[model samples]
Target: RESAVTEALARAVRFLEKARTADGRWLDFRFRFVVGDRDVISSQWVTAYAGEALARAGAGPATLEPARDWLMSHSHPGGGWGFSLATPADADSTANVVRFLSHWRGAPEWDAALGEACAQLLRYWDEPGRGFRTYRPAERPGWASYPGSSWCDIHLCVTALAAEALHAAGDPRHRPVLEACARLLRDSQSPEGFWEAYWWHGRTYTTTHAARLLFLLGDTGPVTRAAHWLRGAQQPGGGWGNGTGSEAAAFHTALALPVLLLDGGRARHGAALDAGLRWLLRAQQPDGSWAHVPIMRMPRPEVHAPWEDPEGCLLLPVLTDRNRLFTTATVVSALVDFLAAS
Candidate 1:
C-alpha cells in the first residue's frame, strides 16, 4: 500500500513532467528584481531550479538528461548562467547549476566547464569577510546589492547557495570559504531563528537555505533553532506565510516544508510536517498545478526617466501561468523529499 507521502510524490512528479517544456527546460515568466530592471521575462533561473528539483527527486535519466543538457548548452562563456540566456552570468545561477551538476558521477566531459563555473563563483567570494557576493569586482568584502545600485554584493542567501555548491563539488581548498560562510550565517541569524534576505520577500526562504547549509556542514545547533522558529510560524491552516502578515502561500509553504522536515527530523517534527503536507495536498489545482500568490517582489528605488514619473515606483503582482509551473515544480520537489525521508 502506498503511503500519503508516496502518493503525493507521484502526483507531484506527474504534474511537473507534464509541465516540462519541449526543449527540456522549464521556462517561466518572472519579474526581474535587479535595480533599474523590472521586466517580466522568460527565465532560465526557473529552469535551473525546476531541473534541480526534478533531479533531486530521483527522476530517471530519460526525464533529467534533457534538462541537464539544456543547462550545459546555455552556459555563458564566463562559465555560469544568467536568469535568462541574454543576461550576464551571476553567482546565484552558477551556484544552482553547480549544485545540480554535482549529482552526476564520473562525468569527465563536464569537468572542465564545471571547474570554470566554480572559478567564476570563486571570483565573487568575499575573501576577507567570508561570504559569497552576487556579482564581482567589489571594492571591499561584504558589499550587498542595493535596490537602486547595479553592484552585486554579498548576501546571506547567495552565500549559503555558494557554500552548498562548494561543498557539493568536494573541493578541499574551498573548505575555508565554506567555514567562513558558516560562521557568517551563524553570526547573522536572528534570535527568532531566521536569516534576513535582501532580494526574497520573506525570511522563510532565507531561513530554509541557512538550515540546509548548516545541516550539510554538520552544524545542527543553528538548524535546530531554525526548525523551532518554522514550527512556530506555521499558520492555522497548515501552511506558512511569507512573514508579511499575508495569507499562506503555496510557494513559501512548499519551500519551507522540506527544510523543516530535513532540519527538524521527520520523527521529531512529524506533526508539523504532516500539517504542511496536508495543506499542500489541499492546495493543488485540478490541473495538477499549485496556485501561487504574488508575495515575492523586487525592490524599486527612485528612478528619473524622461517619460516616466517616479511616483514611488508602482509595483505589479506576479500572477501568471508560468508561476504556476514554478510552484508545482517546487512543491513536487518538497514532496519527494518528504517521501524519501519518511
Candidate 2:
C-alpha cells in the first residue's frame, strides 16, 4: 500500500511540476462564471494553495522556493493578499498563504511573515457574521458580473480557512475570533452534518474545511457531526458526489476525506476513508489528472442561504475550470493526508 501510494504521489508531483507556470503559479483554467467570458483567477491564490499541498506531499523549501518567492514578493502594503495581484488585500488569499507558510515554520524567514500574516488575518473579522469576510469593505472586489451585490460578505470556506490559520498561529489575541467562528460554525451546521458554502456549489468542500477547522479549535462536536455526514455521503462503491446517487466524483471525494482523518473522527471513519481513497486512485487519469465538475459557485442574488444547494437555486451558477489542476491538487492533498494519517 505504501509503495503504491508513494508511486501515485510521485506521478502527481511530476504532473504538478509540468503544469506549473514559469512564475511558480498554475495556469488559469477557470470557466468564468459566465460562458464566453474569460476566467481570471489569482496566480498567487493557486500557487499558495497548490504549493501547500506539495509541501504536505514532502516537498522541501528548495523545491518550493520559486512559489515562496512569488508569494512573498507580492504582499500588499496594507497586509494580506488578494485573489489577483491587482486586486486589494482579502482574507481568502491571506489565510491560504499563511496556511502554506505554516508548513515552512521552522525557517525564521517564514516565521516572521507568518507573524505578520496572523495580524493581517485578524483585520478581516466580521463581527456581524461572526466570521471572516472575503475582503474588507474598502477593498471589496467588484461583484458587477456576479449574482451578489458585493464580494465582501462572509463565506464559510474562506472564514473556516482564515480561522484555521489564526488558530494554528497560536496567538492569544486571535483566540476570540476563533472562539466566535467556532460557535458560528456549530450553530449554522445542518442536523444532517454539513455546512453551506458561499463560493462553492455544494456541501462537501465547506463541510470538510469547516469540520477540520472546528477540530483545530477544539470544538469536536461539530467535527463529529460533519464526519458522520461524510461517511453517510460516501457511495456504496466508494467515493462521493453531490449528495446524490450519481457516480462518485473525485472532486467530492477529495473534499470529503481529510476531515475524516482528523483525530476527532479518524478511527470511526477509516473504512470510508479507505473506500474513498480507492475510488480516488481508480479515477486518476493517465496524465495524472482527474475530470473535474464545475463545483465552484457565485452567490445567489440577495440570498444569504449558503448551506442550500447552489445548483438547485435559480440564481446561483456553479463555474468550472477544465484544466483539471484544481481537481488534481485536491486529490493529491487528500492522498497525502491519508498517507500521513495511516
Candidate 3:
C-alpha cells in the first residue's frame, strides 16, 4: 500500500510534470528588489531549481532528460549558465546547474560540461579569502541588491550554493576552497542564529543555506541554534514567515521545513514538523499548487518604480499565479524530504 506521503508526493510531481513547457523549462518571474521591477525573467534558474527538486523527489530519468538537455543547450560559452539565454553567465545560476548535473556525474557526455561549469564558477572566487561573489569582480565588484547593500562582496547564500555543488561533484582539488567557504559561513552566523542575504527579505532563506552548509561541514552548534530559532519562529498557524512577526507564507515555510527536520532531528521536532506538514497539506489548492507571494523584499526607495509596488513591499504577502510553479516545486521537495526522514 502506498503511504500518505508517497501519495502526496505523486500529486505534487504530477503537477510539475504538467507545468513543464514544451522545451522542458519551467518559467517564473522574479522581481528585482534592487531595481524595484518585476521585469526580470528567471526561466533558466527556476528550471534548474525545479529539475533538481524533481530529481530529488525520485522522478525517473525519462521524465528529467529533456529538462537536462534544455539546460545544457543554454550553457554560456563562458562555462556557466545565465538567468536567461541572453544574459551573461552568473555564479548562482551556474552553481545551480552544476548541482543538477551532479546527479548524473559519471555519465561520459556530461563530464566535459561539468568540468567547464566548475571552472566557470571558480572564476568568481574572491581571492581564496572571501567566499564566492554573485558575479565576477569585473562585472559587479560589490554586491548589487538592497538591504545591507554592499556590506559583503562575497554573498553567503551564493557561496553556500557553490560549496554544496563543488562538494557534491567530488573534486578533491576544490577542497581548500570549500574549506574556506565553510569558515566564512561559520564565522558569519549572527548570534541570534541566522545569516542575512541582500536579495532575500529576512534570515530564513539564508539561515537555511547556512544551516545546511554547516551541517555538511560537520559543525553542529550553529545548526542547532538555527534549528532552535526556526522552531521558536513558527507561526501560530504552523507555517513560517520570511522573518519574525511576518505573515505565514508557503515558500518560506516550505524552505524552512526540511532544515528544521534535518537539523532539529525528527524526534525532537516531531510535533512541530507534523503541524507544518498538515498546514501545507491543507493549503494545497485543488490544482495541486500552493499559493505564495514574493518574499524577497527591500526598503521602498524614494524613487521606486510606480508599477504596483504593493504596500508591504518590505514583506509583501499577496499571492499571484506567476509564483505557483516555483512554489509547488519547492513545496513538493519539502514534502519529499520530510517523508524520507520519517
Candidate 4:
C-alpha cells in the first residue's frame, strides 16, 4: 500500500518524530535562537513547518496536541512568532506559524490568533510607502522601514504565506495587501527578472525563496526567470547550494528542483531533477537520515558572524542543525506532489 508519495510522507513523519523536543517542541540544533536555555525551547519556523508535516501525515490530536500547546504558549502575546522558544515575535517566524495553523483544523481560537498576528504585521507596514520589515520595529527600529534591504526578502516568503492565511481566515481585507505585495515583488525584479536579495548578497537560497514567493503570488515572469537561474545554477552532479557547501547544494537542489518542476512543468529540467533525486535517494543513510557538509558550529547563544568559516566545520548532530528536516520536508513534499500530479 506504499506509494512513492506515501513513502515520502512516511520519511517526513520519521523526521518529525526526531525533531520533537523533550519539552514537546522542535528547534534547530546549529541555528539556536533561543534566548536562555538551549535544551528546551522550540523553533517557531521549524515547528510551524513541522506542524504541516504532522498534519499531512495524518497525525492524530494525541500526537499533535503537545506541539500545538507549546506553540500557543510561546506565541507572542501581541502577535506573530520569533525564531526560538519564548523569543520575541518577528515577521518571518510569525508569518510562517500563521500559515501552518491556518492549514490545520482550528476555528475561533486559531482565527483570533491569526487576526492578531496579521495586525502586528500591519503595524510594520510602510503604509505611507509599501512593503514590510524583517522583524518587528518595536524590538529593532527601522529594520523593515529601510528600503532595498534584507527585510525585502522577508516580504517574499511572509507575504505569500500571509496570503494563504488570509484566504483561510476569510479575511477579505488582506486581499489588497497580498496584491500590493505581489506588485512590489514584481517591481523588485531586475531587468534580468532575477531579484537580488539583501540577506545573502548573492545566493541561491534568496533566489529560491523569491521564486516561491512569486509562485505563491501567481506572477509568472519572475518565477520563470528564477527557475531559469536555478536550472543553470544546478551543479554538474545535479545539485545546488544554500550559500556554500556541497551537501547544502544537494539540500537546495532537493528544495528548488521540485519548485521548478511544479511551477514551470517538466521539460529538460526533469533530467536535472531526476539526477538530484537520485543523489538524495542514494545518499540517504540506512536510518533514513541525511547530513550536510559542516559549516561553522557556533555556540547556542551566539548569532551567526559574517566572517565565520567558509570551508567546513563539523559539529555534533542535533535535530535542528541537521538540515535534513528543512531539506527532506521540502524535497519529500515536492516529490509527493510531483508523483501525484504526474
Candidate 5:
C-alpha cells in the first residue's frame, strides 16, 4: 500500500522535472487570453506554484533553486507578481509566489521581497470592506478590461489567498488583516456552506482557499459548514466538478480533497476523502501527469449567470488552464500533502 502511494509521488515528481524549462521555469500556458490586443503568454505564476509544490513535496534546492532564481527576477521589486510577465501584480499571484518562495528558500535571499509582498497585500485589503481585492483600484496596474475585469470585491478567494500569505509570513503586522479575513469568511459563507470564487473556476477552488485560511486562523465555526457542503458535493464517482452540470474534473477534485483533509472535515469525511483519492489515482495518466481541467476563470463581467433569477449580477466566463504541468503539480502537491498529514 505504501509502495503504491510512494511510487505515485515519485512518478509525479519526475513528470514535473521533465516539464521544467531548460533554464528552470514552469510556464503556465494561456491559449485564449489576450492583453492589449495580443495573445498573453507567460511563466510567472505557474513557476511559483509548480516550484512551490515541488519544494513542499521535498525536492531539494538543487531542484527548486532554478525556479527560485527565475521567479526572483520576475517578481515586482517591492512585492507582488503579475499573472504573466506582461500583467500587473495581483493578490492571487503575489500570495502564490509568497508561499512558493517561503517553502523554496529560507535564507535572507527572500526576506525583503516576500516582506514587501506581504506588506502590499495589506493595501489590497480593507478597500471594499474587510476583503482583499485582486487589484488595488488606485494603484491597480492596468486592468484586463475586455473579456476581463478589474473589480476587486467580487470573490472571497483573493481575500483568502492574501490571508494565507500573511499568515504564513507570520508577521505581526498582518494580525488585523487576518482578523478581518476570518470575519468576512464567517459572514460570507452561504447557508448551504459554500463560498463563491470570482477568479477561479468554481466554488471548490475558492472554498478550499477560504477553508484553509480559516483552518490556519483557528476559526473552525464557518469551516464546519464548508466541510459539510464539500462532503455532500462529492460525486458518486468519487470526484468533483467545477459546478452544477459540469463533468467530474481532476482539477476540482484535487482542490476539494485537501480541504477535506483539514480538521473540521477530517474525521467525518474519511470515506469521502478516500473515494476522492481513488478517483485521482484512476485519473492519473501513465505519464504521471494528470489531465488538465479548467483551473482558471476568464470572466465576462457584464455576462450574467444562466441560473439568474430576478436577482441580477452573477458573473460567468470561459474556463481555462489546459496546462498539464500545472494540473500535475497541483495534484502532486495535494497527494504529497495527504501523505504527510496521514
Candidate 6:
C-alpha cells in the first residue's frame, strides 16, 4: 500500500499527466481545439490555467512550454490577446495573459512584452468613466468605444486580471487603477454586504471573485463578507447547490472554497469544506473525470461559453464552468493548502 504522502504524490502525478497536452502543455479535461473545427477551442485562458496547474504539480516548464509558446504566438502586435486562439486580440484576454505570465516571472523579453501589454491596457481603460472599453484605436494608442467594454467591474475579472498583469509587468500605473476598482466595488456593496457579481448573476462564486480582488488589493472586509456569504449558502451536506442547478453549485463551491480556506475566520467552514470535498470525491469517476448529471446549455463551444436565460436575457444563465480545470485545480489547491495549513 502507498504511504499517505506517496499516495498524494501519485495522485498529483496522475492529475498532471491527465491534464498534459501532446505538445507538453497541460490542458483541461474534455477540451479540443482544431483550426476551423466545430469543437471546444482551448484558448489562452485555459492555457494559462493549465500552466499554473503544471507549476503546482512539480513539473514546471517541461509541462508549460507549449502553452507559453501559444500565448506568445497569439499576442497582438499592439500587445493584447483575443478571447480565444483564433479570435482577434483584445484587452480582457491580454489581461488574463499577463496574469499568468507574471507568475512565471522569467526572461527579460517576457517582462518587456508584459510591460507593453500594460501600456496597452492603460490606454484601453478610461478611469474617469469607471469602466473600460475593450481595445484601443488603431493610431491613438488609447481605447476607442465598441472594441468591447472599456472596463468591467461587476465580477472583478477584468480589473483583477489586469492588475495582476500590471503588477507582474512592474508597472505602477495599474496600481491606482486596481485601487480605484477596489474602492468602487467596496462602495457598491449591497445593504446585505455582498457585491453582486457581473458574471454569475445570483451565484456566490462571481461575488467571490470580487472579494478576491479586494483581498489582493489589500482590503479584508469584503473578503470576510464573501466568506460569510459562502458559509451561509452551504447545503445541509456542506456542498452548495445553485437553486436548481448542480453544476453551478459544484463549480461555485469548488472556486470559492480555496479562498475561504485561506482567508480564515470561519471555523465551521472547515466542516463545509470537508463536506464539499467529500461530495466532489464521491462524484469523481474511476477515470478521474467528473461530469454533471446534466450540462447547462451554452451558446458557443468555447471552454467558457456565453449563454442566456430561457427568455434570452443577456446575463441570466451566469455561471460558466472553468471546465475540469476549475474543479480539478481548485480541489487540488484547496486540499493541498488545507493539509499544509493543518
TM-score of each: 0.85, 0.88, 0.85, 0.74, 0.88, 0.73
Q: Each prediction's Cα lDDT score? A: 0.72, 0.75, 0.73, 0.55, 0.72, 0.53
* Candidate 5 residue lDDT tens string, 1-342: 456667887888888888888778787666544335665655878887888788878887777989878877777665668677676667777777777766623557577767766766565667447887776544433354322444544358878877887787777877888888878888888898877776665677678888888888787777777777877788889998865446778878888888777853346677887888889888889988888765565554454332232123333334455658877877887787678765
With candidate 1 superimposed using the best TM-score fit, by how many Å does residue 341's alpha carbon deviate from the native?
2.3
For candidate 6, lDDT tens digit of each residue in 1-342? Answer: 124433443465466556666664433323222233454444665666556544554555656667777777766665566645444565666666666666556678877766765676676576774534444434323112222232222224455555545655666656788777677667766555454433333445445556767777778887777677667667776666542234334455565576576567236466766676666556554545444322222122211212124224332233344345544554454445445544
Model 2: CA > 4 A from native: 33-38, 139-150, 244-246, 263-267, 306-309, 312-317
Which of candidates 4 and 6 is the stronger one according to TM-score?
4
Which residue runs of candidate 6 sit more than 4 Å off their true CA positions?
1-13, 24-40, 131-155, 167-170, 242-249, 265-268, 292-323, 336-342
**Whose TM-score is greatest here?**
2
> Candidate 1: lDDT over CA atoms?
0.72
lDDT of 1 by residue, 155-178 (tens): 777898889888887767888888
- TM-score, structure 4 vs. true: 0.74
Candidate 5 stretches greater than 4 Å from native: 34-38, 77-79, 104-106, 138-150, 264-266, 301-317
Is 5 or 6 the stronger prediction by TM-score?
5
Q: What digit string (tens of lDDT, one per residue) describes model 2 on residues 232-268?
A: 7788989898653446888888888887887433567
Clashing pairs in 5: none
| Residue clash pairs of candidate 4 | 28-320, 29-320, 29-321, 133-144, 240-249
RMSD of 4: 5.8
Full candidate order by lDDT, most accurate first: 2, 3, 5, 1, 4, 6
Backbone collision tally, model 4: 5
Model 4 C-alpha lDDT per residue in residues 1-342, reported as the tens digit of each score: 226446655665676676677666766534433233444343776677666656555667765667777777777666667766445566656666665666553677777866776676565564433455555434333112233333332444444444444445556787777677667767766555445433232345445555665676566677777777667666777666653334334456555665576555556466766676666666665545556543222212122222143222122222234646555555555555455444
Give the TM-score ranking, best first.
2, 5, 3, 1, 4, 6
Whole-model lDDT, candidate 4? 0.55
Total residue pair clashes for candidate 5? 0
